[PDB]
Design a protein around this ligand. Sequence first.
Ligand SMILES: COC(=O)c1ccc(NS(=O)(=O)c2sc3ccc(F)cc3c2C)c(S(C)(=O)=O)c1
Length: 221
Amino acid sequence: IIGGTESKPHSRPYMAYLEIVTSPSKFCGGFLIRRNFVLTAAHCAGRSITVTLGAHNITEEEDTWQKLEVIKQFRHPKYNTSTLHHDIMLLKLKEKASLTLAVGTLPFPSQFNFVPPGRMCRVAGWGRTGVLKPGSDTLQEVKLRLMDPQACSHFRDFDHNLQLCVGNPRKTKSAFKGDSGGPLLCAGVAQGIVSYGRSDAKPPAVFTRISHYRPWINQIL
Ligand SMILES: COC(=O)c1ccc(NS(=O)(=O)c2sc3ccc(F)cc3c2C)c(S(C)(=O)=O)c1
């Protein structure tokens, strides 16, 4: 998260931190939708994934931490490994998390509108705070603007109708590396998932549209 501020501790109890091991390690975001299911981006898939819940500080272990092993990675069946179309994945945790002050579920409303540009939303994560910067010690959140699709025209495989263009190009505020899989929260409802952007972190970034995959996510609910 670039250009954001520290969240109030445990004010985002659904946030998940992913430690991914390949067959090199990756770090992603995610959010708890149910006690044993985490929603994240499909490109975060690897061999081993460990989920940390109930964390504000990610660098030193807290009493509110809950670490769970992923036992199944359910990528969307039409996910494209290079163009990142349908970049959404369901993770089944080995055990059930404990609902506490620090661990909670993100509720999904009965209606998911196709959200047009112009909306102001929030994204949170422990990702890099800038280009070449390390991951944030604590959970950061930044307010971002849903941009017109023409602002993401430089991305070769961007599709306005499948993805969100998020981030004012004249600022530095944006999600970045390590924030992938984290939710884009508009008005308290997760409308997007951090997918990708530019290596030099110049916004906008590309977000998966959650509204398209509500019936598919309804498998878990
Ligand atoms: C068609 O796909 C691509 O064009 C592409 C681009 C970058 C990239 N990964 S990235 O460089 O670490 C990066 S930059 C950035 C900026 C803002 C942001 F919210 C996130 C990110 C991320 C993840 C990948 S990916 C995840 O599949 O490896 C794919």
